[PDB]
Structure 1
């Protein structure tokens, strides 16, 4: 995997899970990209048409990359490293129930994690890291990006 050569990136929500309103989905993805722009010189801008650097969709079972999803629980989402077309993209398993809280899987947390992949991060060995492979909802009131994830993203793009 390689990093992005440019600091200004774009995304597009191609489709939307019915579990949340369009604007809850948009808020979640906005807050998730902010996780990373708040600690780098990166910037994210949403488009409503055209192909953006990061194309976001909701899928279930097989869905065109032939890395199928798998139903409730299990694989929750995945994403591709930096690069053209498919690179950057983020798919979310809509067989999960997506929520703004804990009534299912929290979309903001899974998106913040997947977008770390979109930017070149690997999974972490540190179980307290956002980039750790297993999802947890620790229910804290104010999200604070763990130090392991800060260092990994700043190792690629430096700080702000």
Structure 2
């Protein structure tokens, strides 16, 4: 017989993702680069690896949508809800949805896709929101004045509690 694990996390270290569609705001290449950077955030702090697929069913299915887009978490136009992701599991588990009513960028203007993706992929891996206002996993997007992205201890401790 078998039983479910209590804590939601991936039991395999080699995970796949697929970009199902693309925002108009950035080139295919720029969108791909943002998501790869966002996954490297987590692979640098865990034994996890991420591989992009060009078709078929991946562990993490990434898509852009607006308002109602096929789940219980409709988007709300510009600002407010930027994105959401499902915790580890089969079916929709891991999937990440991005609101295409946002202005997506690779800069400090609008909403930085890499930064939002890095946060949402945290959710894809099993993290909940942080109560720490400086954490990656704090719920409210807060672009800081730092030159480079650095993962805070809060988020590192959270992800380590799941993946070691």
TM-score, with length taken from structure 2? 0.94
Measured in 2, the distance between the counterparts of 1:122 and 1:48 equals 29
Match of 1:40 in 2: 46
1:67 deviation in Å?
1.3
Corresponding residue number in structure 1 for 2:94: 88
Render the CA deviation track for 1:11-65: whole Å, top value 9, x for unaligned.
0000000000000000000000000000110000000011000000000000000
**1:85 Cα deviation from its structure 2 partner:** 1.6
Cα shift at 1:103: 2.0
Task: Provide the C-alpha distance between the structure 1 equivalents of 2:14 and 2:117, rounded to a whole number of angstroms.
Answer: 19
1:141 Cα deviation after fit: 1.6
Q: Deviations over 1:108-157 (max 9, x none)?
A: 00000000000000000111100001101114221110000000001110
- In 2, distance between residues paired with 1:28 and 1:85? 24
Q: Distance in 2 between matches of 1:135 and 1:103?
A: 12
Please give the root-mean-square deviation of Cα atoms over the aligned residues, in Å: 1.0
Distance 1:99 1:124 in 2: 24
Q: d(CA) in 2 for partners of 1:98 and 1:81?
A: 23
Distance 1:139 1:24 in 2: 22
Render the CA deviation track for 1:70-96: whole Å, top value 9, x for unaligned: 001110000000000200000000000
Aligned length, in residue pairs: 158
Q: Which runs of 5 or more structure 1 residues have no equivalent in the other structure?
A: none
User: TM-score scaled by structure 1?
Assistant: 0.96
Mapping 1:50-65, distance limit 5 Å: 50-65=56-71
Stretches of structure 2 that go unaligned for 5 or more consecutive residues are 1-6
What pairs with 1:1-160 in structure 2 (closer than 5 Å)? Answer: 2-157=8-163
Structure 1 Cα separation of the partners of residues 79 and 138 of structure 2: 17
Alpha-carbon distance in 2 for matches of 1:131, 1:24: 23
Distance 2:109 2:66 in 1: 19
| Structure 2 Cα separation of the partners of residues 77 and 67 of structure 1 | 9
